[PDB]
């Protein structure tokens, strides 16, 4: 499936000093007309390890995918996060060209549902699977004002996959301030990509089936 969400407009990413230079990405960028949305999430290299941070309101970011070719000739690792559980898997995924976690309504009861088949078409010769409490916890609370910041570190050099994370409140606008598991995965990691969740509903005559829409989302990256 994976209808080809893509955008013509692209810009040289701005960067800020982390208090080293870290590049700043916009995933969904609002138009001055408020009309069009820019879907773009590049693949990126993985030089030894990566520092990842974002500030977020609405669960737009749900996990990451890691591998080398990101296709059926090789293993790849996938992390994705429900409202209630994380699941971690190694399988020989066939990723499509623009993966996202689609979510849609299910009229026969009052529920929203999301489906993994919008990110891959098939899996085979799968091996490792694990489940736990979620990583993308909401902060236990702050009354807005950039109500959270979340930071992660990924490291693989030792022959293991290691996550680190922290959650903190914050105050400063639009800039970085001056203010969990160890997995025995056997894999070669060289590139990675983040996956968003997008929602669709039928509410107005004559709209396209590609109704997929989301709010603004942004994140920062920097290499070890």
């Amino acid at each position, epitope marked *: 499936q994976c209808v080809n969400l893509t955008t013509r407009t692209q810009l040289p990413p701005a960067y800020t000093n982390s208090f080293s230079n870290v590049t700043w990405f916009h995933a969904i960028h609002v138009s001055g007309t408020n009309g069009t949305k820019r879907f773009d999430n590049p693949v990126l290299p993985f030089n030894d390890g990566v520092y990842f941070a974002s500030t977020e309101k609405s669960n737009i970011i749900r996990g990451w995918i890691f591998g080398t070719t990101l296709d059926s000739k090789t293993q790849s690792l996938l992390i994705v996060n429900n409202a209630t559980n994380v699941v971690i898997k190694v399988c020989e995924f066939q990723f499509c060209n623009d993966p996202f976690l689609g979510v849609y309504y299910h009229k*026969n009861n009052k529920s929203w549902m999301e489906s993994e088949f919008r990110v891959y078409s098939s899996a085979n010769n799968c091996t490792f699977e694990y489940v736990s409490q979620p990583f993308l916890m909401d902060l236990e609370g702050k009354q807005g004002n950039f109500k959270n910041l979340r930071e992660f570190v990924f490291k693989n050099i030792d022959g293991y996959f290691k996550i680190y994370s922290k959650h903190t409140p914050i105050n400063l606008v639009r800039d970085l301030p001056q203010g969990l598991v160890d997995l025995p995965i056997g894999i070669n990691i060289t590139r990675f990509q983040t996956l968003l969740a997008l929602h669709r509903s*039928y*509410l107005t*005559p004559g709209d396209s089936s590609s109704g997929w829409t989301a709010g603004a989302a942004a994140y920062y990256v920097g290499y070890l």
Partner: antibody
Amino acid sequence: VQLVQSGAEVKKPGASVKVSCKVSGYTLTELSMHWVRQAPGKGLEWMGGFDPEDGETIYAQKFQGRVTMTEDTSTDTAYMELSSLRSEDTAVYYCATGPAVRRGSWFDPWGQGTLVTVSS
Amino acid sequence: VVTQPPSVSAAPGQKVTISCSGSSSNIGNNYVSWYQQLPGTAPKLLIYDNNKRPSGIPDRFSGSKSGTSATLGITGLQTGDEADYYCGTWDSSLSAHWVFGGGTKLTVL
């Protein structure tokens, strides 16, 4: 959304009938479904359909006993079936759809219609 | 049942109006919508929520509500518009259901 429904049928009185609506470019579970009838030269007559407020199918007062509705959610076809045909049942039957999260005021895509005739 | 006039008549370019009227239960309580049917072809949605036009509808069409009646305004009449027009609404009775008006033929001289 695109719709295609099964072609015309010719039968003798007292028979039942079943027609299908195939929905494509979208998934059936998001859509409300309705059936509407036109006899020759007459106005449109609504037969029944799903009501968002009930989470249930609703039937038109004159038909209640005669009509049934079902789905193959494995092949996203809706079905409608009618018993006890008679000559004044001869009409063109249309498939139409609308919003499901709220009671909409409209049905936007309509099928091409199909004509059922019964004689002798 | 909501009432409608049987027919209306004019030459090209003049004004004409279509009128749909009935109980407070049908028209008054809820929104109205309007449909056009060409002879031998499936109906098409024209206007919804009293006034909004979906994409591609020309400007010559407008809609209004008048208590428990509602009306359609046509501008610039062109000879292609030999068609039926129907109002439709929900019914707010305990016998809650959708209702279509009797339809009107538009003829142009």
